[PDB]
Amino acid sequence: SVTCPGGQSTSNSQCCVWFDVLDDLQTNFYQGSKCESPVRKILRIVFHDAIGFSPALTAAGQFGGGGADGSIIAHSNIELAFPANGGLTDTIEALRAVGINHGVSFGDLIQFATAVGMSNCPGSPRLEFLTGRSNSSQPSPPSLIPGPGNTVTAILDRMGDAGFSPDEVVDLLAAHSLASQEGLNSAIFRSPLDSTPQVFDTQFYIETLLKGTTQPGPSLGFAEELSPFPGEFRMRSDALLARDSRTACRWQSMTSSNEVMGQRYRAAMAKMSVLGFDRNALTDCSDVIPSAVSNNAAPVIPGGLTVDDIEVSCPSEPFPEIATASGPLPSLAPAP
Ligand code: HEM
Ligand SMILES: *[C@@H]1O[C@H](CO)[C@@H](O[C@@H]2O[C@H](CO)[C@@H](O)[C@H](O)[C@H]2NC(C)=O)[C@H](O)[C@H]1NC(C)=O
Ligand SMILES: [Ca+2]
Ligand SMILES: [Ca+2]
Ligand SMILES: [K+]
């Protein structure tokens, strides 16, 4: 409907300020619309901000957390002391300055920066963006963040409390297709979790299913498992979720279609974005989100490996017929 000062047209007047936030984030935060570390860090922040929400705690008479309320920024002094929130300070401070300079709430800003960041990464879907989340928050309670050494039962329970089914947990983990680690094993800083850290694709689901044969660094870091080729890092929670009977068939169905994986992820992220809010009280400004370049590569089992190297864990569905590559094993360079 409406036309914003820069000539773009939008649904509601409430969407116009986001065209300014968009320009600042692309030019500055993302250094010229790049899909590099700032995007990967923001993806950890949206999850850690939203998951501080617990109905079980509320039911027991305690404060359960406000969900996607920007509390990780507003109360960064409390929240970045939590063990799973390390390596985020510089990104939280960069976001704080954009929030304050544009007059937007921190909770909306984190959702927006996640949608805009993913648009710089090829193969990504257009995430929904809603605005109107209140800027006031209280610190998230401790212990509501799943860690890499937790069992599958522990993760599924914490995530189930928040509101996610076992399938949606698997769906949410498609974000590890654009990921690396920096704090589990600093000796192999920014070692990627899949062979394409800059392409939102299916490779993460394929490669975590491959037999662990390689130790990529001098020693094994915290919650580190043997990976399928040099340079790739494999964390325990991911290796176990790929193989556990409760999640193994969803993990397997995510391996052959980037279109299927992107739509399931988009739906799971839209649910995570309103944890603590009523989406019917928010204004939809999804039209402000730009498209990503398309990924035209087909899913592959890398470096000469075959289906014989996949530890097929879904007893009921045959493993998808995926393409093979004629090559030596790759050695992965650090993610950018
Ligand atoms: C079962 C829950 C999950 C666990 C246990 C988990 C654990 C981890 C760990 C240990 C790292 C490495 C952090 C570091 O040392 O630098 C990581 C990275 C990452 N995770 Fe997850 N994660 C989970 C869910 C998610 C979700 C739901 C998202 C977001 C939608 C997400 C997005 C990312 C991204 C993008 C990175 C890469 C950060 C970077 O490269 O700097 N993770 N995750
Ligand atoms: C959202 O609430 C936060 C927390 O009160 C506000 O952040 C402060 O803003 C002032 C002035 O704008 C800054 O000097 C402080 O440094 C900020 N504090 C923190 C912890 O970041 C923020 O301004 C509020 N946003 C809006 C749009 O009202
Ligand atoms: Ca929060
Ligand atoms: Ca990838
Ligand atoms: K679909």
From Swiss-Prot:
GO terms for molecular function: heme binding; lactoperoxidase activity; metal ion binding. Its EC number is 1.11.1.7. InterPro entries: Ccp1-like (IPR044831), Haem_peroxidase (IPR002016), Haem_peroxidase_sf (IPR010255), Ligninase (IPR001621), Ligninase_C (IPR024589), Peroxidases_AS (IPR019794), Peroxidases_heam-ligand_BS (IPR019793). One of its GO terms (biological process) is response to reactive oxygen species. Ca(2+) 1 binds at residues 49, 67, 69, 71. One of its GO terms (cellular component) is extracellular region. Binds 2 calcium ions per subunit. Binds 1 heme b (iron(II)-protoporphyrin IX) group per subunit. Ca(2+) 2 binds at residues 177, 194, 196, 199, 201. Its cofactor is Ca(2+); heme b. It catalyses: 2 a phenolic donor + H2O2 = 2 a phenolic radical donor + 2 H2O. This is Peroxidase. The keyword Disulfide bond applies. Its main location: secreted. The record marks 44 as: Transition state stabilizer. It comes from the Eukaryota. SUPFAM superfamilies: Heme-dependent peroxidases. Disulfide bonds join 4-16, 15-285, 35-121, 249-314. Glycans are attached at residue 135. It is found in: Secreted. Heme b binds at residue 176. Belongs to the peroxidase family. Ligninase subfamily. It is an enzyme of class 1 (oxidoreductase).
